[PDB]
């Protein structure tokens, strides 16, 4: 009845673990129950990740739910490729087809390339952060030569937080040389809130500018500060709060005590934590399908030292890969399904424009259909003051005597 | 393999690394204080206990593009070898007026 | 030396003296002049433009 799994959590991801504990209770049946082993470590230090993964492998788990950084993603993906241990993650998907990885985050590359094509952009800025892989930067660069775009890629990531005022004032001085008015922000929801505040300081948020936040949590970050400036701000949202499923989850979420569940007493949940809750439903239903299929998975004995040479892989990991990769359930992230590589498939990403009345569901795409939502007859603002410019030169435009 | 040498008790490790494997060595030698001496492309950032023989080519590439007075050119790169140098010419593409 | 996944991470002392020795080496070689900074990157080096 006790199924052992390993959890690799960043030390600063309290809500991302708060959602994990909630999932354990919601899907806990009388047939069995999952037993987690939680190791809070530094996600970037791959030596800690290696020391953590091998801690769970010696304890003999059956799958591992964790995260990874750019500096550590390969460490996870290669140990799981040899030892045939299954890894479920809500971080960015692996740049390539790696087995035994259950990527809970959908591929956003298809979204950004077409959102650009909807607005008919042919010259824009791209402030990226390598903390989540250069997968998307190679996408906009590859499609830049095909469609003959004129793009400026700026590795805004490696910047120090003490000289941040003088360097951020310096970045926008470069972008002024082409009078760039179309910017894509590709940082994590943290550094975006840093760029947002420095955009308000220099005042580049009025009529004319048009930003696109490129992560799955448009409503996660704060938008009320660049809402009324007049700059159109687009984004992406994966946790559709309109679905009665999430509203069922949000109602129970809004009430939990914040001491036992940090960062959970609010009405929203970050796309990272939301994918974590939806990860438990994948694993619980994965093993339940092993039971009904009459499949025996318990380890024959000690898995031994992960550094065992030659590396002998326990055979039943393949059945766990095929079990997790054939799960199909419904959760906060809408539809959930995986291909033979573990990548998100058959999914749905919501598109959001920021207006005067707040975030507004405008569009959505799919790995088969792109930009379909037409339209939003509901909501609506019906408020548009058209800006008209003219020159003081008699007798066309003269200031009255009074 | 880094552990196969640590048990044997080597006093320094000469080796190489790839784009995927560089971070494995950099943080391993950073905690266990083993000295890594290698020619493989220099660490993107300051990682202690690593000695890079190959000089920083990127600083030299920027200077050469200036002397030739280029404005629009094609830059070919392979994701396997990396793109730490393509990053450098893309960052400096705004300040120096380049349409890469 | 034992295992590399030694918990807690026991860092041997003489490793920090080896790091200092390497970066303090200054000789001549096929790459031109060779001296290092406290991080390990080449300095005072020479790249021919051909
Ligand atoms: C694809 O998604 C649709 C919409 O939710 C679902 O009804 C269908 O079963 C899925 N098909 C496959 C093959 O997973
Ligand atoms: C710098 O390099 C030159 C060329 O080899 C060498 O002659 C000089 O001594 C070096 N500087 C120092 C301080 O060693």
From Swiss-Prot, chain B:
Tissue: Detected in forebrain. Detected in dendrites of neuronal cells. Expressed in the pyramidal cell layers of CA1 and CA3 and in the granule cell layer of the dentate gyrus.
Induction: Down-regulated in the pyramidal cell layer of CA1 in the hippocampus by global ischemia.
Localisation per UniProt entry: Cell membrane; Postsynaptic cell membrane; Postsynaptic density membrane
PTM per Swiss-Prot/TrEMBL: Palmitoylated. Depalmitoylated upon L-glutamate stimulation. Ubiquitinated by RNF167, leading to its degradation.
Domain of life according to the entry: Eukaryota
UniProt note: domains: The M4 transmembrane segment mediates tetramerization and is required for cell surface expression.
Description of how the protein assembles with itself and partners: Homotetramer or heterotetramer of pore-forming glutamate receptor subunits. Tetramers may be formed by the dimerization of dimers. May interact with MPP4. Forms a ternary complex with GRIP1 and CSPG4. Interacts with ATAD1 in an ATP-dependent manner. ATAD1-catalyzed ATP hydrolysis disrupts binding to ATAD1 and to GRIP1 and leads to AMPAR complex disassembly. Interacts with GRIP2. Interacts with GRIP1. Interacts with NSF via its C-terminus. Interacts with CACNG2, PICK1 and GRIP2. Interacts with GRIA1 and SYNDIG1. Part of a complex containing GRIA2, NSF and NAPA and/or NAPB.
Function: Ionotropic glutamate receptor that functions as a ligand-gated cation channel, gated by L-glutamate and glutamatergic agonists such as alpha-amino-3-hydroxy-5-methyl-4-isoxazolepropionic acid (AMPA), quisqualic acid, and kainic acid. L-glutamate acts as an excitatory neurotransmitter at many synapses in the central nervous system and plays an important role in fast excitatory synaptic transmission.
Family per record: Belongs to the glutamate-gated ion channel (TC 1.A.10.1) family. GRIA2 subfamily.
Identification of the protein by name: Glutamate receptor 2
Annotated source species: Rattus norvegicus (Rat)
Gene name as annotated: Gria2
């Amino acid at each position: 009845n006790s199924i052992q799994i390993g959890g690799l959590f960043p030390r600063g991801a309290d809500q991302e673990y708060s959602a994990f504990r909630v999932g354990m209770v919601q899907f806990s049946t009388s047939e069995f129950r999952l037993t987690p082993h939680i190791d809070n470590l530094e996600v970037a230090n791959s030596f800690a990740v290696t020391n953590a993964f091998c801690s769970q492998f010696s304890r003999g788990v059956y799958a591992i739910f964790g995260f990874y950084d750019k500096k550590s993603v390969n460490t996870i993906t290669s140990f799981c490729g040899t030892l045939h241990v299954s890894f479920i993650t809500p971080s960015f998907p692996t740049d390539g087809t790696h087995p035994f990885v259950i990527q809970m985050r959908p591929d956003l590359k298809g979204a950004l390339l077409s959102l650009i094509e909807y607005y008919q952009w042919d010259k824009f800025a791209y402030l990226y952060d390598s903390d989540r892989g250069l997968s998307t930067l190679q996408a906009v660069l590859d499609s830049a030569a095909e469609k003959k775009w004129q793009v400026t890629a700026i590795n805004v990531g490696n910047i120090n937080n003490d000289k941040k005022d003088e360097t951020y004032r310096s970045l926008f001085q470069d972008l002024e040389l082409k009078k760039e008015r179309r910017v894509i922000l590709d940082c994590e929801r943290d550094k975006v809130n840093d760029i947002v505040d420095q955009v308000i300081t220099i005042g580049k948020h009025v009529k004319g500018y048009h930003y696109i936040i490129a992560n799955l949590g448009f409503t996660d970050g704060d938008l009320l500060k660049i809402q009324f400036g007049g700059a159109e701000v687009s984004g992406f949202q994966i946790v559709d709060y309109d679905d009665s499923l999430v509203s069922k989850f949000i109602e129970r979420w809004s009430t939990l005590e914040e001491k036992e569940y940090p960062g959970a007493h609010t009405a929203t949940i970050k796309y990272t934590s939301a994918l974590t809750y939806d990860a438990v439903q994948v694993m619980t239903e994965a093993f339940r399908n092993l039971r009904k299929q009459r499949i025996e998975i318990s380890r024959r004995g000690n898995a031994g030292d992960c550094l065992a040479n030659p590396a002998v892989p326990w055979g039943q990991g393949v059945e766990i890969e095929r079990a997790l990769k054939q799960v199909q359930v419904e959760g906060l992230s809408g539809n959930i399904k995986f291909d033979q590589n573990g990548k998100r498939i058959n999914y749905t990403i919501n598109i959001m424009e920021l207006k005067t009345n707040g975030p507004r569901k405008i569009g959505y795409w799919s790995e088969v259909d792109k930009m379909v939502l037409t339209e939003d007859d509901t909501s609506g603002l019906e408020q548009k003051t058209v800006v008209v410019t003219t020159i003081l030169e008699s007798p066309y435009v003269m200031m009255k005597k009074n």
